[PDB]
Amino acid sequence: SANDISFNFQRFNETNLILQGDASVSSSGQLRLTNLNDNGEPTLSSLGRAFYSTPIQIWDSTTGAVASFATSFTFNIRVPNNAGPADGLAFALVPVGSKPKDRGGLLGLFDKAHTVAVEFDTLYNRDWDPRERHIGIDVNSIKSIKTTPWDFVNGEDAEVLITYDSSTKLLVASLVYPSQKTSFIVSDTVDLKSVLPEWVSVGFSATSGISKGNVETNDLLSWSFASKLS
Amino acid sequence: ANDISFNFQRFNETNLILQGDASVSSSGQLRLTNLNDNGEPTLSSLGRAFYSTPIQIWDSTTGAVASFATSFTFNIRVPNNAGPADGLAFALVPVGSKPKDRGGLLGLFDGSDSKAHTVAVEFDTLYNRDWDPRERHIGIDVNSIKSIKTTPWDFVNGEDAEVLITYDSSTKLLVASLVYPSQKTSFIVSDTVDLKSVLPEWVSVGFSATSGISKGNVETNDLLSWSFASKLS
Amino acid sequence: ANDISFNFQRFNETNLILQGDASVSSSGQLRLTNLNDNGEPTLSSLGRAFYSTPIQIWDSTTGAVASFATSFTFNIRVPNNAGPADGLAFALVPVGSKPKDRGGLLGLFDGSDSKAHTVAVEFDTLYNRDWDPRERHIGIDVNSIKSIKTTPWDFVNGEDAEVLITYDSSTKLLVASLVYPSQKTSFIVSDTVDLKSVLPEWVSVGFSATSGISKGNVETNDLLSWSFASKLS
Amino acid sequence: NDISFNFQRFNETNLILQGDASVSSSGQLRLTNLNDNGEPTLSSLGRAFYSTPIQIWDSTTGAVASFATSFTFNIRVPNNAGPADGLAFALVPVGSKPKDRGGLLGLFDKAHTVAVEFDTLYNRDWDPRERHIGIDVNSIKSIKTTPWDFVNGEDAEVLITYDSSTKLLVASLVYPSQKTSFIVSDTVDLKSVLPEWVSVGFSATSGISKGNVETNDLLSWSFASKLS
Ligand SMILES: *[C@@H]1O[C@H](CO)[C@@H](O[C@@H]2O[C@H](CO)[C@@H](O[C@@H]3O[C@H](CO[C@H]4O[C@H](CO[C@H]5O[C@H](CO)[C@@H](O)[C@H](O)[C@@H]5O[C@H]5O[C@H](CO)[C@@H](O)[C@H](O)[C@@H]5O)[C@@H](O)[C@H](O[C@H]5O[C@H](CO)[C@@H](O)[C@H](O)[C@@H]5O)[C@@H]4O)[C@@H](O)[C@H](O[C@H]4O[C@H](CO)[C@@H](O)[C@H](O)[C@@H]4O)[C@@H]3O)[C@H](O)[C@H]2NC(C)=O)[C@H](O)[C@H]1NC(C)=O
Ligand SMILES: *[C@@H]1O[C@H](CO)[C@@H](O[C@@H]2O[C@H](CO)[C@@H](O[C@@H]3O[C@H](CO[C@H]4O[C@H](CO[C@H]5O[C@H](CO)[C@@H](O)[C@H](O)[C@@H]5O[C@H]5O[C@H](CO)[C@@H](O)[C@H](O)[C@@H]5O)[C@@H](O)[C@H](O)[C@@H]4O)[C@@H](O)[C@H](O)[C@@H]3O)[C@H](O)[C@H]2NC(C)=O)[C@H](O)[C@H]1NC(C)=O
Ligand SMILES: *[C@@H]1O[C@H](CO)[C@@H](O[C@@H]2O[C@H](CO)[C@@H](O)[C@H](O)[C@H]2NC(C)=O)[C@H](O)[C@H]1NC(C)=O
Ligand SMILES: *[C@@H]1O[C@H](CO)[C@@H](O[C@@H]2O[C@H](CO)[C@@H](O)[C@H](O)[C@H]2NC(C)=O)[C@H](O)[C@H]1NC(C)=O
Ligand SMILES: CCCCCC
Ligand SMILES: CCCCCC
Ligand SMILES: CCCCCC
Ligand SMILES: CCCCCC
Ligand SMILES: CCCCCC
Ligand SMILES: [Ca+2]
Ligand SMILES: [Ca+2]
Ligand SMILES: [Ca+2]
Ligand SMILES: [Ca+2]
Ligand SMILES: [Mn+2]
Ligand SMILES: [Mn+2]
Ligand SMILES: [Mn+2]
Ligand SMILES: [Mn+2]
């Protein structure tokens, strides 16, 4: 029963995605999670999500097996002139068929949750966030089990790698800016069996801010995923 | 680029589109055609099953064509005092394609004058005199149940068959091989296929099978494992 | 579990052990056998070439046996008014083994009473009356030039042949296939081989080829590309 | 010209061992010397390379490899000692011999060498003060470092990647036991520093002075390269 799935997209197409809320694929093959107006500028209170169109098996109830996975992606978050960024984007494992949740600081993921995410959090929410912008590991809550500071760079491609090792239960997320040569990493244990259903949708969720001048694009340029169910 | 790879040692309904009689058993076998509650195959059965996300086979903007490889183990079992019919096939079909004719048309083709935009590799257990060669055969099927090429296949009742199908977009060569690990026998067929001119840009990949329409011509059409990989140049 | 994988679209001497007449050309072809000053293959030529790191095929502590898959493109060219001889083989051999007999023994086996501890897949272009089947063939060779199993091979002069060899350690099935993309012809042979009982734990993987010993029986033995993968379960 | 390997246990048969390096009966790559009590010894120097060279770039085509390596290491310091000197993953010229002991990690003394060091001993002439992960381009004086909170005797998991399209080299380390993680990244022009073909592997040294010593054990190693 040793199952695997791997995919690699250097360009996106709608045909193998479930798009929700504001998410679209551009004619240039970019996954734009949040809404652009007719002038190509990001709008307020935007919420988009996008998932690979086939569910991934994360664990097996008969055998007690848990999947290991790795994903990499390139994102571009651009803030217009005279604006600050909000709210961020996340890679997520969510229940099959789940619909977007609350927007703004809850990143379309949160509002019995069964969601694990890695957030790239561009806006301080004083009720649960650390002060600086951060990479967070989110287990059924917007209040991360662990964060690491992230020195956000406006409009420059970020390259992410997230891995999950089912033998150590360690989830590790890293981001590098090839242009700035800066890099960030966070790691914590997450018991996927105890939090997620057996099958999940994998993909992304992103929101723009709810108030004028708190806004950003949330673009994915490339995405690779691989899972192995031991 | 748009690459995809999967490996199923056990099947689950969650990542398949099942059509007609196809089911996944509680043991994780993909049973393409109908079994009664005693595990005996029924007449005039038709099932298909596809991976639930479409595969990009070629790109009209760039002219790129995918290369792919698939392997699978199948088990065709014929009840005592029957011969086998009709066979099973691995296929690339248009997204949202519905099953076609039963019996000798393997749920992939019909007697219509419309092109199926379907490429398949058939494991054909029943002679249809209007298009088949006389012996049981592996065929390469391009928009027709009349294979562009076949090779004889010495069918073995109820024994696991291991298949490998490869498509090289640089030579346009499609190659299908089958081995019976129990009998140590092997078969192979090869032909060129221009995927761009026959398939749409995106396809569903999976299987189609039919049982015979007449008493004493019947078989199971079980898949035990399936691996697929595609790479769009 | 341990693995090794490599893929060469062009050869370089830096990652090969070359023996006898084997050379790598400035165009990146692995030429196993020699050319005379007239640009024709010479008589009694013998070359071998191995990946320069040994592969672990099995483990005596764990009882694990490797599964492997290899693919390669070869070009055998015969001068006008000649027939081909003797052939080329993919082989697993003991680490540090030296070339064996010329001609019909393909540089892999000799007339000694010692076990060569060698498994090969031969592409045999010359009938040897003491042990061969009548037609040219793909053979599976276990410690002897007298193949445990062969399949006829319709040799085509000077056309690229594409080979795939797989070994599944769970069924012990070794399968070899050849296709000519130009002719769309294909051949396959399969048999079980217990690698633990024949090979040492570590082997060198690569090729062996010979040209004929008598005028008018001669060929080139060129490798154009080679991919290998092993997985020690 | 692509190459991939994965060793969950080591064997001598596919390695070039230099100086003190050995493979144990348990299949661990021990880069530095152990005494009869299984304790690490002073002034040890060991290297170990995959026994086939890797093609890193091609002068005819201008192609540069992308690569990725992962490995688990165990650095153990005896009681009443501190650690020295560290271990490194390196790309070195084919047939390269070990260089200087101690703080030079067996790699330096233009040695046409690129390395990622896990540096357990402050050398005031070139190091930053805290233990660190460094990117080393032809010098023991890293082009870039990041602090590393060394944990005595706990398994460390490393990932190093090199993307030839961005020229970005990234190294990361995690302690699964402590849930701590570290990362450093810089651009490296491999064409201008390495030969076309290299040996890939490890170099490690134990300290030269009493009470500065460590084991330098590799437990698993995966490597993959792709010459575009
Ligand atoms: C392919 O993969 C699939 C999917 O993974 C495999 O299918 C699974 O197989 C396992 C093992 O056989 C099944 O486990 C068994 O489940 C039953 C309970 O079944 C009923 O409840 C299911 C759960 O419902 C809750 O959770 C879901 C989300 O996870 C939620 O949507 C529901 O609304 C519900 O929520 C409620 O409960 C929660 C806590 O439990 C609360 O928080 C929440 O707020 C609510 O109160 C449900 O999915 C299931 O429905 C499926 O199956 C029915 C048929 O029964 C079908 O009609 C439906 O369409 C669904 O498909 C049911 O309603 C449980 O009783 C079993 O327990 C026995 O075994 C355990 C294990 O040892 C023992 O501890 C027990 O004592 C007992 O003896 C068992 O756990 C699982 O139900 C099933 N899931 C699905 C989605 O089908 C499939 O087998 C794979 N195929 C192959 C070939 O391998
Ligand atoms: C990586 O993978 C590799 C390859 O698979 C593994 O390596 C292989 O490991 C196996 C298992 O250890 C080795 O084979 C064994 O080697 C044993 C030693 O072989 C040598 O020594 C033998 C004995 O030598 C003594 O006796 C002879 C007389 O018979 C004298 O001539 C000689 O001088 C010695 O005499 C002295 O000691 C004896 C002690 O018995 C006294 O009696 C005398 O008084 C005197 O003092 C010798 O016979 C033999 O020919 C060798 O020289 C051997 O015992 C055993 O049976 C077995 O063969 C492989 O050698 C090794 N292979 C390679 C390629 O190196 C490795 O394990 C793996 N590593 C991991 C981590 O898994
Ligand atoms: C993704 O692929 C789809 C399908 O090939 C493309 O959508 C088709 O585009 C053609 C060309 O304009 C239309 O005539 C079809 O009707 C489209 N089909 C659908 C379902 O709308 C699409 O262009 C590709 N997307 C990107 C971003 O490349
Ligand atoms: C195999 O690789 C070797 C080592 O790079 C190539 O030889 C070198 O080629 C470069 C560029 O052509 C020269 O700058 C070096 O001086 C060569 N060194 C030698 C010949 O030792 C060699 O050409 C490659 N072989 C093939 C068949 O491509
Ligand atoms: C380290 C995570 C495993 C990646 C393969 C699914
Ligand atoms: C994804 C594999 C390509 C097919 C040619 C052997
Ligand atoms: C190493 C992969 C080979 C498996 C044999 C089919
Ligand atoms: C399907 C390709 C086989 C050659 C080695 C991966
Ligand atoms: C061979 C894979 C390279 C990946 C480096 C980012
Ligand atoms: Ca926030
Ligand atoms: Ca028929
Ligand atoms: Ca012969
Ligand atoms: Ca130092
Ligand atoms: Mn946050
Ligand atoms: Mn037919
Ligand atoms: Mn022969
Ligand atoms: Mn240092």
Residue numbers in the entry:
A (entry chain BBB): 2 to 112, 117 to 235
B (entry chain AAA), C (entry chain CCC): 3 to 235
D (entry chain DDD): 4 to 112, 117 to 235
Sentences from the paper on this structure:
The crystal space group was found to be P1, and the asymmetric unit contained an rTBL-1 homo-tetramer composed of two antiparallel dimers. The jellyroll fold consists of (1) a “back-sheet” with six β-strands, (2) a concave seven-stranded “front-sheet”, and (3) two “stranded-top” connecting sheets. The tetramer was obtained from the back-to-back association of both dimers stabilized through interactions between the β-strands 10 (amino acids 186–194) of the corresponding chains. They are located at the top of the “front sheet” in the vicinity of the predicted carbohydrate binding site and are indispensable for lectin activity. In accordance with the mass spectrometry data, we observed electron density that corresponds to the N-glycosylation site at Asn19. This permitted to build the proximal and the distal GlcNAc of the common core of N-glycans in all chains as well as six and four additional residues belonging to the antennas of chains A and D, respectively. No structural evidence was found to suggest that the binding pockets could be affected by the presence and/or size of this posttranslational modification.
In this work, we present the production of a recombinant lectin from Tepary bean (rTBL-1) by using P. pastoris engineering, its biochemical characterization, crystallographic structure, and an analysis of its specificity for cancer-type glycans. The taxa inferred by the evolutionary analysis showed that TBL-1 belongs to the group of phytohemagglutinins of the Phaseolus genus; more specifically, the data suggest that TBL-1 is actually a homologue of PHA:L, a leucoagglutinin from Phaseolus vulgaris, present in four of the five different populations of PHA heterotetramers (E4, E3L, E2L2, EL3, and L4). The absence or the elongation of the glycosylation, if produced in other heterologous expression systems, could affect the overall folding and functionality of the protein. rTBL-1 recognizes β1-6 branched N-glycans, which are overrepresented in several types of cancer, including colon cancer.
